[PDB]
Every structure is written in C-alpha cells, then in structure tokens.
C-alpha cells in the first residue's frame, strides 16, 4: 500500500537471501564436478551414432 | 558427453594398455622363432609341386 509495511528492510533482506539461494542452486549441481547450469558450460554434444 | 567423464586420463591408460596388448598379440607368434605378424617375416612361398 506504499505506506503500511515499514518492514522493507527485512523484506529486502528476504529477497536478497532468496537471490543468494538462487545463486546456490546455480552451483551445487556438479554432476561430475562439472556444475551444469552455472559457471562455464562448454556447450557439449552427446555422440549417439 | 564431451565433458562428463573427467577420468579420460585413466581412459587413455586403458586404451594404451589395449594397444600394447595388441602389439603383444603381434609378437609372441614365434611359430619357429619366426613370428608371423611382426618381427622378421620374409613373405615367403610354400612349395607344393
């Protein structure tokens, strides 16, 4: 309501913790010590023939 | 997967051992101390007439 919740400090802290959690989900997906979604993914290609 | 198995070092060791076993199969065919495939084979001709 632009004037009701003066708790904007903890609100920004909440969304900042959520962004940090997102950055963590980016990492910790190391299927082979080669974390998939984040970092530098080599744009691989699986040979099937 | 072009990036999934970082154990390509042991993979190379495996392939090199397979190649060395191939070269050993080439040797050790000393049918008379005249190993057929490698070593010294004169590419001779068997007389039958």
From Swiss-Prot, chains A, B:
Subcellular location: Secreted; Bacterial flagellum
Post-translational modification: Phosphorylated on tyrosine residue(s).
Highest taxon above the source species: Bacteria
Family: Belongs to the bacterial flagellin family.
Biological role stated in the UniProt entry: Flagellin is the subunit protein which polymerizes to form the filaments of bacterial flagella.
The protein, known as: B-type flagellin
Naturally occurring in which organism (per UniProt): Pseudomonas aeruginosa (strain ATCC 15692 / DSM 22644 / CIP 104116 / JCM 14847 / LMG 12228 / 1C / PRS 101 / PAO1)
Residues of the full protein shown: 102 to 150 of 488
């Amino acid at each position: 309501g632009s004037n009701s919740d003066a708790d904007r400090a903890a609100l920004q802290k909440e969304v900042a913790a959520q962004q940090a959690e997102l950055t963590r989900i980016s990492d910790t997906t190391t299927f082979g010590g080669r974390k998939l979604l984040d970092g530098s993914f080599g744009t691989t290609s699986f040979q099937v023939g």
